[PDB]
């Protein structure tokens, strides 16, 4: 009634990049009420997704659960599947991987049963994400591997391949490229590097045939990372440079920094310690500009190593010591966990951070319009 009118204003506002407004309208909408439980389900779903977008994952979870419940009572299978998929993604963010699996699985099963192809795909992707998050959530999230990380990332791989084959036979490209990204990453972490090279190459190809802003940067980055883990230091450096150009255009201090750090790491591998020290210095200036103490510490360390390799004693001492203090802040030092004496080299790699970028969540949508 007015519930509908209100909800439509909310949907309009969210659509137009004003989530907080839209949410206040959805809240008024629920507060008024409707006997049309399909559209009430829509209001619940949209609220769920809006709160997700706003990084209030608690409310997100709640509203998606009401949506799920609702769907189930009125026996709306499709509603139930899409609500369940949103629940799965919310849970993934909250780190409840088991329920997230149960939920995204349900999404898939139902979507199959309803002979929905697009939906089936989406749920497959999500399952790949859940297994990717799960895989990363044990110890250090890098490319190196207990039986658990193995199982979960391998599972991730499979799901990424079911998805990939199926959005291959549906002629979705944006989808295929997202799956290629995340599959490149999952290979990357798994140790199967050439495959990662392949798939990353593909994701690059599609971000290219769309002209994707702020998302070419990331295929660059991940290619660079794989090459660094093979030996192609030089070419990787080129890639990261690209990424830094881009990032400094778009005004993102973050990927600016990470691009610098990655770069410096590459010239330290390239034995050009001067350019290395420069890049890591820029990263130091960005990092301490943003109250990023852990970043500041890692810069301190990398620079200490580069200076030491360069012959400069004083700067090495100073930076090593600053790094000590910064470590003392972020933890205990009665076991001296801060002290890492092995330097970055072709035989190390694991000694420095190389940030990789995963894609995104493909959410599930109800509309009243």
mmCIF file of C-alpha atoms in Angstrom:
data_model
loop_
_atom_site.group_PDB
_atom_site.id
_atom_site.type_symbol
_atom_site.label_atom_id
_atom_site.label_comp_id
_atom_site.label_asym_id
_atom_site.label_seq_id
_atom_site.Cartn_x
_atom_site.Cartn_y
_atom_site.Cartn_z
ATOM 1 C CA UNK A 1 0.000 0.000 0.000
ATOM 2 C CA UNK A 2 1.992 2.926 1.374
ATOM 3 C CA UNK A 3 4.313 0.088 2.297
ATOM 4 C CA UNK A 4 4.879 -0.480 -1.404
ATOM 5 C CA UNK A 5 5.255 3.235 -2.210
ATOM 6 C CA UNK A 6 7.806 3.601 0.598
ATOM 7 C CA UNK A 7 9.686 0.497 -0.491
ATOM 8 C CA UNK A 8 9.808 1.868 -4.039
ATOM 9 C CA UNK A 9 11.330 5.104 -2.858
ATOM 10 C CA UNK A 10 13.903 3.061 -0.944
ATOM 11 C CA UNK A 11 14.730 0.933 -3.976
ATOM 12 C CA UNK A 12 15.069 4.079 -6.020
ATOM 13 C CA UNK A 13 17.447 5.647 -3.520
ATOM 14 C CA UNK A 14 19.633 2.578 -3.165
ATOM 15 C CA UNK A 15 19.782 2.152 -6.918
ATOM 16 C CA UNK A 16 20.954 5.771 -7.142
ATOM 17 C CA UNK A 17 23.858 5.426 -4.750
ATOM 18 C CA UNK A 18 22.138 6.542 -1.569
ATOM 19 C CA UNK A 19 21.910 3.403 0.589
ATOM 20 C CA UNK A 20 21.353 5.031 3.985
ATOM 21 C CA UNK A 21 18.318 6.918 2.632
ATOM 22 C CA UNK A 22 16.880 3.916 0.918
ATOM 23 C CA UNK A 23 17.341 1.941 4.114
ATOM 24 C CA UNK A 24 15.375 4.450 6.131
ATOM 25 C CA UNK A 25 12.565 4.057 3.627
ATOM 26 C CA UNK A 26 12.703 0.284 3.736
ATOM 27 C CA UNK A 27 12.559 0.532 7.540
ATOM 28 C CA UNK A 28 9.493 2.727 7.417
ATOM 29 C CA UNK A 29 8.075 0.243 4.858
ATOM 30 C CA UNK A 30 8.480 -2.753 7.161
ATOM 31 C CA UNK A 31 7.082 -0.671 9.965
ATOM 32 C CA UNK A 32 3.900 0.042 7.983
ATOM 33 C CA UNK A 33 3.417 -3.555 6.827
ATOM 34 C CA UNK A 34 1.954 -5.481 3.925
ATOM 35 C CA UNK A 35 -0.164 -8.588 3.512
ATOM 36 C CA UNK A 36 1.657 -9.197 0.231
ATOM 37 C CA UNK A 37 4.412 -11.393 1.684
ATOM 38 C CA UNK A 38 6.213 -11.685 -1.642
ATOM 39 C CA UNK A 39 6.948 -7.940 -1.597
ATOM 40 C CA UNK A 40 7.632 -8.044 2.157
ATOM 41 C CA UNK A 41 10.219 -10.679 1.262
ATOM 42 C CA UNK A 42 11.624 -8.176 -1.243
ATOM 43 C CA UNK A 43 11.870 -5.458 1.407
ATOM 44 C CA UNK A 44 13.681 -7.889 3.678
ATOM 45 C CA UNK A 45 16.102 -8.918 0.946
ATOM 46 C CA UNK A 46 16.881 -5.361 -0.146
ATOM 47 C CA UNK A 47 17.436 -4.345 3.476
ATOM 48 C CA UNK A 48 19.786 -7.311 3.875
ATOM 49 C CA UNK A 49 21.837 -6.325 0.848
ATOM 50 C CA UNK A 50 21.847 -2.668 1.749
ATOM 51 C CA UNK A 51 23.194 -3.380 5.195
ATOM 52 C CA UNK A 52 25.796 -5.681 3.659
ATOM 53 C CA UNK A 53 26.943 -2.864 1.375
ATOM 54 C CA UNK A 54 27.144 -0.597 4.440
ATOM 55 C CA UNK A 55 29.353 -3.051 6.330
ATOM 56 C CA UNK A 56 26.762 -3.767 9.008
ATOM 57 C CA UNK A 57 26.913 -7.553 8.459
ATOM 58 C CA UNK A 58 24.888 -8.244 11.610
ATOM 59 C CA UNK A 59 21.738 -6.553 10.342
ATOM 60 C CA UNK A 60 22.470 -7.989 6.887
ATOM 61 C CA UNK A 61 22.420 -11.492 8.358
ATOM 62 C CA UNK A 62 19.203 -10.849 10.289
ATOM 63 C CA UNK A 63 17.240 -9.422 7.369
ATOM 64 C CA UNK A 64 18.406 -12.169 5.025
ATOM 65 C CA UNK A 65 17.271 -14.668 7.663
ATOM 66 C CA UNK A 66 13.801 -13.080 7.858
ATOM 67 C CA UNK A 67 13.769 -13.196 4.052
ATOM 68 C CA UNK A 68 14.686 -16.903 4.193
ATOM 69 C CA UNK A 69 12.064 -17.678 6.813
ATOM 70 C CA UNK A 70 9.389 -15.776 4.938
ATOM 71 C CA UNK A 71 10.283 -17.441 1.638
ATOM 72 C CA UNK A 72 10.054 -20.844 3.254
ATOM 73 C CA UNK A 73 6.640 -20.361 4.897
ATOM 74 C CA UNK A 74 4.907 -19.120 1.719
ATOM 75 C CA UNK A 75 6.756 -21.917 -0.097
ATOM 76 C CA UNK A 76 8.662 -19.640 -2.486
ATOM 77 C CA UNK A 77 11.525 -21.886 -3.699
ATOM 78 C CA UNK A 78 13.321 -19.207 -5.704
ATOM 79 C CA UNK A 79 13.030 -16.699 -2.879
ATOM 80 C CA UNK A 80 14.452 -19.328 -0.526
ATOM 81 C CA UNK A 81 17.420 -19.989 -2.808
ATOM 82 C CA UNK A 82 18.369 -16.363 -3.288
ATOM 83 C CA UNK A 83 17.903 -15.569 0.434
ATOM 84 C CA UNK A 84 20.010 -18.587 1.262
ATOM 85 C CA UNK A 85 22.766 -17.443 -1.085
ATOM 86 C CA UNK A 86 22.852 -14.012 0.495
ATOM 87 C CA UNK A 87 22.989 -15.672 3.889
ATOM 88 C CA UNK A 88 25.919 -17.720 2.678
ATOM 89 C CA UNK A 89 27.862 -14.646 1.583
ATOM 90 C CA UNK A 90 27.102 -12.755 4.808
ATOM 91 C CA UNK A 91 28.254 -15.779 6.811
ATOM 92 C CA UNK A 92 31.459 -16.027 4.777
ATOM 93 C CA UNK A 93 32.256 -12.465 5.775
ATOM 94 C CA UNK A 94 31.426 -13.286 9.413
ATOM 95 C CA UNK A 95 33.727 -16.324 9.289
ATOM 96 C CA UNK A 96 31.024 -18.927 9.927
ATOM 97 C CA UNK A 97 32.165 -21.036 6.951
ATOM 98 C CA UNK A 98 30.160 -24.117 7.842
ATOM 99 C CA UNK A 99 26.761 -22.411 7.730
ATOM 100 C CA UNK A 100 27.964 -20.412 4.773
ATOM 101 C CA UNK A 101 28.585 -23.672 2.936
ATOM 102 C CA UNK A 102 25.213 -25.131 3.991
ATOM 103 C CA UNK A 103 23.540 -21.964 2.707
ATOM 104 C CA UNK A 104 25.380 -21.506 -0.628
ATOM 105 C CA UNK A 105 24.964 -25.210 -1.238
ATOM 106 C CA UNK A 106 21.221 -24.843 -0.716
ATOM 107 C CA UNK A 107 21.281 -21.940 -3.169
ATOM 108 C CA UNK A 108 22.906 -24.281 -5.709
ATOM 109 C CA UNK A 109 20.747 -27.386 -5.122
ATOM 110 C CA UNK A 110 17.533 -25.351 -5.427
ATOM 111 C CA UNK A 111 18.792 -23.435 -8.465
ATOM 112 C CA UNK A 112 19.567 -26.767 -10.138
ATOM 113 C CA UNK A 113 16.203 -28.238 -9.161
ATOM 114 C CA UNK A 114 14.471 -25.171 -10.662
ATOM 115 C CA UNK A 115 16.580 -25.691 -13.787
ATOM 116 C CA UNK A 116 17.932 -22.174 -13.398
ATOM 117 C CA UNK A 117 21.280 -21.951 -15.230
ATOM 118 C CA UNK A 118 22.411 -18.440 -14.292
ATOM 119 C CA UNK A 119 21.519 -19.044 -10.645
ATOM 120 C CA UNK A 120 23.332 -22.382 -10.607
ATOM 121 C CA UNK A 121 26.396 -20.579 -11.866
ATOM 122 C CA UNK A 122 26.177 -17.854 -9.179
ATOM 123 C CA UNK A 123 25.871 -20.421 -6.384
ATOM 124 C CA UNK A 124 28.880 -22.284 -7.811
ATOM 125 C CA UNK A 125 30.934 -19.111 -7.718
ATOM 126 C CA UNK A 126 29.893 -18.381 -4.152
ATOM 127 C CA UNK A 127 30.851 -21.920 -3.127
ATOM 128 C CA UNK A 128 34.267 -21.294 -4.684
ATOM 129 C CA UNK A 129 34.558 -18.092 -2.652
ATOM 130 C CA UNK A 130 33.554 -19.790 0.596
ATOM 131 C CA UNK A 131 36.178 -22.441 0.025
ATOM 132 C CA UNK A 132 38.696 -19.710 -0.853
ATOM 133 C CA UNK A 133 38.031 -17.777 2.345
ATOM 134 C CA UNK A 134 38.056 -21.044 4.297
ATOM 135 C CA UNK A 135 41.368 -21.995 2.722
ATOM 136 C CA UNK A 136 42.909 -18.648 3.555
ATOM 137 C CA UNK A 137 41.633 -18.714 7.145
ATOM 138 C CA UNK A 138 44.349 -21.110 8.340
ATOM 139 C CA UNK A 139 47.738 -19.584 9.196
ATOM 140 C CA UNK A 140 49.560 -17.348 6.695
ATOM 141 C CA UNK A 141 47.354 -16.621 3.589
ATOM 142 C CA UNK A 142 50.191 -17.050 1.054
ATOM 143 C CA UNK A 143 51.499 -19.285 -1.817
ATOM 144 C CA UNK A 144 53.357 -22.255 -0.272
ATOM 145 C CA UNK A 145 50.068 -26.207 3.084
ATOM 146 C CA UNK A 146 48.565 -28.560 5.714
ATOM 147 C CA UNK A 147 46.028 -31.122 4.538
ATOM 148 C CA UNK A 148 43.185 -28.722 5.446
ATOM 149 C CA UNK A 149 44.342 -25.752 3.361
ATOM 150 C CA UNK A 150 45.012 -28.290 0.629
ATOM 151 C CA UNK A 151 41.520 -29.766 0.747
ATOM 152 C CA UNK A 152 39.721 -26.441 0.936
ATOM 153 C CA UNK A 153 41.682 -24.740 -1.836
ATOM 154 C CA UNK A 154 41.428 -27.805 -4.077
ATOM 155 C CA UNK A 155 37.679 -27.868 -3.436
ATOM 156 C CA UNK A 156 37.703 -24.161 -4.271
ATOM 157 C CA UNK A 157 39.424 -25.039 -7.557
ATOM 158 C CA UNK A 158 36.863 -27.670 -8.550
ATOM 159 C CA UNK A 159 33.965 -25.295 -7.837
ATOM 160 C CA UNK A 160 35.681 -22.611 -9.878
ATOM 161 C CA UNK A 161 35.883 -25.135 -12.760
ATOM 162 C CA UNK A 162 32.214 -26.247 -12.596
ATOM 163 C CA UNK A 163 31.302 -22.582 -12.599
ATOM 164 C CA UNK A 164 33.748 -21.865 -15.380
ATOM 165 C CA UNK A 165 32.564 -24.627 -17.705
ATOM 166 C CA UNK A 166 28.946 -23.662 -17.113
ATOM 167 C CA UNK A 167 29.338 -19.940 -17.758
ATOM 168 C CA UNK A 168 31.397 -20.994 -20.727
ATOM 169 C CA UNK A 169 28.332 -22.728 -22.194
ATOM 170 C CA UNK A 170 26.170 -19.673 -21.339
ATOM 171 C CA UNK A 171 28.371 -17.130 -23.048
ATOM 172 C CA UNK A 172 28.796 -14.947 -20.022
ATOM 173 C CA UNK A 173 32.192 -13.265 -20.217
ATOM 174 C CA UNK A 174 32.229 -10.940 -17.174
ATOM 175 C CA UNK A 175 31.402 -14.038 -15.135
ATOM 176 C CA UNK A 176 34.036 -16.217 -16.826
ATOM 177 C CA UNK A 177 36.665 -13.550 -16.121
ATOM 178 C CA UNK A 178 35.728 -13.226 -12.468
ATOM 179 C CA UNK A 179 36.039 -17.011 -12.159
ATOM 180 C CA UNK A 180 39.380 -16.872 -14.025
ATOM 181 C CA UNK A 181 40.686 -14.268 -11.588
ATOM 182 C CA UNK A 182 39.744 -16.155 -8.461
ATOM 183 C CA UNK A 183 40.880 -19.461 -10.005
ATOM 184 C CA UNK A 184 44.217 -17.919 -10.850
ATOM 185 C CA UNK A 185 44.498 -16.870 -7.245
ATOM 186 C CA UNK A 186 43.478 -20.281 -5.973
ATOM 187 C CA UNK A 187 46.112 -21.917 -8.192
ATOM 188 C CA UNK A 188 48.586 -19.283 -6.998
ATOM 189 C CA UNK A 189 48.026 -20.166 -3.356
ATOM 190 C CA UNK A 190 47.978 -23.874 -4.298
ATOM 191 C CA UNK A 191 51.438 -23.981 -5.889
ATOM 192 C CA UNK A 192 50.250 -24.734 -9.398
ATOM 193 C CA UNK A 193 51.752 -21.539 -10.811
ATOM 194 C CA UNK A 194 51.687 -22.027 -14.589
ATOM 195 C CA UNK A 195 47.940 -22.712 -14.434
ATOM 196 C CA UNK A 196 47.582 -19.484 -12.458
ATOM 197 C CA UNK A 197 49.539 -17.744 -15.224
ATOM 198 C CA UNK A 198 47.125 -19.101 -17.826
ATOM 199 C CA UNK A 199 43.920 -18.142 -16.021
ATOM 200 C CA UNK A 200 45.209 -14.761 -14.900
ATOM 201 C CA UNK A 201 46.061 -14.141 -18.552
ATOM 202 C CA UNK A 202 42.438 -14.869 -19.419
ATOM 203 C CA UNK A 203 40.959 -12.569 -16.717
ATOM 204 C CA UNK A 204 43.247 -9.898 -18.156
ATOM 205 C CA UNK A 205 41.814 -10.625 -21.620
ATOM 206 C CA UNK A 206 38.213 -9.998 -20.461
ATOM 207 C CA UNK A 207 38.931 -6.956 -18.272
ATOM 208 C CA UNK A 208 40.449 -5.725 -21.562
ATOM 209 C CA UNK A 209 37.439 -6.536 -23.797
ATOM 210 C CA UNK A 210 35.323 -4.511 -21.329
ATOM 211 C CA UNK A 211 37.791 -1.692 -20.512
ATOM 212 C CA UNK A 212 37.516 -2.320 -16.770
ATOM 213 C CA UNK A 213 38.543 0.653 -14.590
ATOM 214 C CA UNK A 214 40.072 -0.121 -11.151
ATOM 215 C CA UNK A 215 39.944 -3.811 -12.074
ATOM 216 C CA UNK A 216 42.666 -4.090 -14.671
ATOM 217 C CA UNK A 217 45.047 -2.956 -11.925
ATOM 218 C CA UNK A 218 44.350 -6.192 -10.100
ATOM 219 C CA UNK A 219 44.955 -8.616 -13.012
ATOM 220 C CA UNK A 220 48.248 -6.739 -13.475
ATOM 221 C CA UNK A 221 49.090 -7.218 -9.811
ATOM 222 C CA UNK A 222 48.270 -10.963 -9.779
ATOM 223 C CA UNK A 223 50.187 -11.619 -12.992
ATOM 224 C CA UNK A 224 53.152 -9.843 -11.424
ATOM 225 C CA UNK A 225 52.865 -12.016 -8.325
ATOM 226 C CA UNK A 226 52.876 -15.261 -10.335
ATOM 227 C CA UNK A 227 55.858 -14.165 -12.400
ATOM 228 C CA UNK A 228 57.759 -13.171 -9.238
ATOM 229 C CA UNK A 229 57.052 -16.674 -7.998
ATOM 230 C CA UNK A 230 58.460 -18.150 -11.228
ATOM 231 C CA UNK A 231 61.478 -15.883 -11.778
ATOM 232 C CA UNK A 232 60.356 -13.175 -14.168
ATOM 233 C CA UNK A 233 61.285 -10.361 -11.794
ATOM 234 C CA UNK A 234 61.769 -7.711 -14.528
ATOM 235 C CA UNK A 235 58.425 -8.156 -16.313
ATOM 236 C CA UNK A 236 56.659 -8.315 -12.976
ATOM 237 C CA UNK A 237 58.219 -4.953 -12.107
ATOM 238 C CA UNK A 238 56.803 -3.529 -15.348
ATOM 239 C CA UNK A 239 53.335 -4.817 -14.365
ATOM 240 C CA UNK A 240 53.504 -3.307 -10.869
ATOM 241 C CA UNK A 241 54.655 0.008 -12.324
ATOM 242 C CA UNK A 242 51.532 -0.026 -14.519
ATOM 243 C CA UNK A 243 49.420 -0.753 -11.458
ATOM 244 C CA UNK A 244 51.021 2.202 -9.576
ATOM 245 C CA UNK A 245 50.386 4.606 -12.463
ATOM 246 C CA UNK A 246 46.750 3.541 -12.482
ATOM 247 C CA UNK A 247 46.385 3.694 -8.700
ATOM 248 C CA UNK A 248 47.886 7.186 -8.478
ATOM 249 C CA UNK A 249 45.450 8.379 -11.135
ATOM 250 C CA UNK A 250 42.409 7.037 -9.278
ATOM 251 C CA UNK A 251 43.650 8.539 -5.965
ATOM 252 C CA UNK A 252 43.931 5.300 -3.965
ATOM 253 C CA UNK A 253 46.714 5.672 -1.383
ATOM 254 C CA UNK A 254 46.320 1.946 -0.713
ATOM 255 C CA UNK A 255 47.174 0.295 -4.015
ATOM 256 C CA UNK A 256 49.649 3.131 -4.554
ATOM 257 C CA UNK A 257 51.507 1.936 -1.461
ATOM 258 C CA UNK A 258 51.147 -1.829 -2.070
ATOM 259 C CA UNK A 259 52.420 -1.175 -5.619
ATOM 260 C CA UNK A 260 55.459 0.594 -4.188
ATOM 261 C CA UNK A 261 56.151 -2.200 -1.686
ATOM 262 C CA UNK A 262 55.759 -4.901 -4.348
ATOM 263 C CA UNK A 263 58.080 -2.812 -6.594
ATOM 264 C CA UNK A 264 60.836 -2.324 -4.056
ATOM 265 C CA UNK A 265 60.640 -6.032 -3.414
ATOM 266 C CA UNK A 266 61.183 -6.621 -7.110
ATOM 267 C CA UNK A 267 64.260 -4.376 -7.401
ATOM 268 C CA UNK A 268 65.658 -5.933 -4.232
ATOM 269 C CA UNK A 269 65.285 -9.155 -6.180
ATOM 270 C CA UNK A 270 66.662 -7.340 -9.241
ATOM 271 C CA UNK A 271 69.684 -6.361 -7.127
ATOM 272 C CA UNK A 272 69.011 -2.680 -7.916
ATOM 273 C CA UNK A 273 69.001 -1.598 -4.290
ATOM 274 C CA UNK A 274 68.761 2.135 -5.032
ATOM 275 C CA UNK A 275 65.366 2.105 -6.788
ATOM 276 C CA UNK A 276 64.333 -0.433 -4.164
ATOM 277 C CA UNK A 277 65.111 2.002 -1.339
ATOM 278 C CA UNK A 278 63.230 4.770 -3.193
ATOM 279 C CA UNK A 279 60.054 2.743 -3.707
ATOM 280 C CA UNK A 280 60.053 1.461 -0.134
ATOM 281 C CA UNK A 281 60.548 5.038 1.063
ATOM 282 C CA UNK A 282 57.441 6.176 -0.815
ATOM 283 C CA UNK A 283 55.566 3.250 0.692
ATOM 284 C CA UNK A 284 56.872 4.381 4.115
ATOM 285 C CA UNK A 285 55.454 7.893 3.559
ATOM 286 C CA UNK A 286 52.013 6.647 2.436
ATOM 287 C CA UNK A 287 51.891 3.965 5.154
ATOM 288 C CA UNK A 288 52.635 6.273 8.101
ATOM 289 C CA UNK A 289 50.371 8.885 6.559
ATOM 290 C CA UNK A 290 47.375 6.579 7.070
ATOM 291 C CA UNK A 291 48.042 5.255 10.597
ATOM 292 C CA UNK A 292 49.139 1.924 9.067
ATOM 293 C CA UNK A 293 51.613 0.812 11.738
ATOM 294 C CA UNK A 294 52.086 -2.739 10.439
ATOM 295 C CA UNK A 295 52.774 -1.352 6.958
ATOM 296 C CA UNK A 296 55.239 1.090 8.504
ATOM 297 C CA UNK A 297 57.003 -1.797 10.245
ATOM 298 C CA UNK A 298 57.283 -3.858 7.054
ATOM 299 C CA UNK A 299 58.690 -0.848 5.243
ATOM 300 C CA UNK A 300 61.197 -0.305 8.095
ATOM 301 C CA UNK A 301 62.334 -3.922 7.709
ATOM 302 C CA UNK A 302 62.585 -4.020 3.869
ATOM 303 C CA UNK A 303 64.506 -0.759 3.899
ATOM 304 C CA UNK A 304 66.839 -1.941 6.629
ATOM 305 C CA UNK A 305 67.668 -4.913 4.428
ATOM 306 C CA UNK A 306 68.154 -2.819 1.294
ATOM 307 C CA UNK A 307 70.348 -0.251 3.064
ATOM 308 C CA UNK A 308 72.439 -3.044 4.584
ATOM 309 C CA UNK A 309 72.910 -4.538 1.132
ATOM 310 C CA UNK A 310 73.884 -1.064 -0.070
ATOM 311 C CA UNK A 311 76.672 -0.426 2.435
ATOM 312 C CA UNK A 312 74.904 2.225 4.520
ATOM 313 C CA UNK A 313 75.309 1.322 8.209
ATOM 314 C CA UNK A 314 73.515 4.160 10.029
ATOM 315 C CA UNK A 315 70.225 3.980 8.152
ATOM 316 C CA UNK A 316 70.222 0.217 8.528
ATOM 317 C CA UNK A 317 70.602 0.517 12.289
ATOM 318 C CA UNK A 318 67.936 3.205 12.630
ATOM 319 C CA UNK A 319 65.402 1.364 10.524
ATOM 320 C CA UNK A 320 66.042 -1.988 12.164
ATOM 321 C CA UNK A 321 65.468 -0.321 15.564
ATOM 322 C CA UNK A 322 62.302 1.554 14.516
ATOM 323 C CA UNK A 323 61.053 -1.782 13.190
ATOM 324 C CA UNK A 324 61.780 -3.213 16.637
ATOM 325 C CA UNK A 325 59.638 -0.579 18.393
ATOM 326 C CA UNK A 326 56.784 -0.997 15.920
ATOM 327 C CA UNK A 327 56.906 -4.744 16.476
ATOM 328 C CA UNK A 328 56.834 -4.188 20.253
ATOM 329 C CA UNK A 329 53.574 -2.296 19.780
ATOM 330 C CA UNK A 330 51.816 -5.001 17.693
ATOM 331 C CA UNK A 331 52.779 -7.833 20.054
ATOM 332 C CA UNK A 332 54.917 -9.610 22.644
ATOM 333 C CA UNK A 333 58.710 -9.691 22.454
ATOM 334 C CA UNK A 334 59.580 -12.124 25.246
ATOM 335 C CA UNK A 335 60.025 -14.753 22.509
ATOM 336 C CA UNK A 336 61.443 -12.276 20.019
ATOM 337 C CA UNK A 337 59.032 -13.152 17.227
ATOM 338 C CA UNK A 338 59.897 -9.800 15.707
ATOM 339 C CA UNK A 339 63.400 -10.918 14.809
ATOM 340 C CA UNK A 340 63.599 -12.183 11.258
ATOM 341 C CA UNK A 341 67.132 -12.258 9.940
ATOM 342 C CA UNK A 342 66.675 -14.034 6.651
ATOM 343 C CA UNK A 343 66.527 -11.505 3.837
ATOM 344 C CA UNK A 344 64.486 -11.371 0.681
ATOM 345 C CA UNK A 345 65.941 -13.498 -2.136
ATOM 346 C CA UNK A 346 65.092 -15.909 -5.018
ATOM 347 C CA UNK A 347 65.400 -18.648 -2.374
ATOM 348 C CA UNK A 348 63.052 -16.829 0.032
ATOM 349 C CA UNK A 349 59.975 -15.074 -1.324
ATOM 350 C CA UNK A 350 58.071 -16.086 1.779
ATOM 351 C CA UNK A 351 60.081 -13.380 3.585
ATOM 352 C CA UNK A 352 58.021 -10.523 2.060
ATOM 353 C CA UNK A 353 54.323 -9.743 1.467
ATOM 354 C CA UNK A 354 52.909 -9.894 -2.050
ATOM 355 C CA UNK A 355 49.279 -8.770 -2.095
ATOM 356 C CA UNK A 356 46.901 -10.506 -4.481
ATOM 357 C CA UNK A 357 43.406 -9.289 -5.325
ATOM 358 C CA UNK A 358 40.377 -11.498 -5.489
ATOM 359 C CA UNK A 359 37.190 -10.554 -7.265
ATOM 360 C CA UNK A 360 33.861 -9.910 -5.566
ATOM 361 C CA UNK A 361 30.590 -11.394 -4.361
ATOM 362 C CA UNK A 362 27.823 -11.819 -6.911
ATOM 363 C CA UNK A 363 24.797 -10.932 -4.776
ATOM 364 C CA UNK A 364 21.166 -12.008 -5.224
ATOM 365 C CA UNK A 365 18.483 -9.429 -5.957
ATOM 366 C CA UNK A 366 14.748 -8.878 -5.437
ATOM 367 C CA UNK A 367 13.016 -5.888 -7.068
ATOM 368 C CA UNK A 368 9.564 -4.300 -6.848
ATOM 369 C CA UNK A 369 9.916 -2.129 -9.951
#
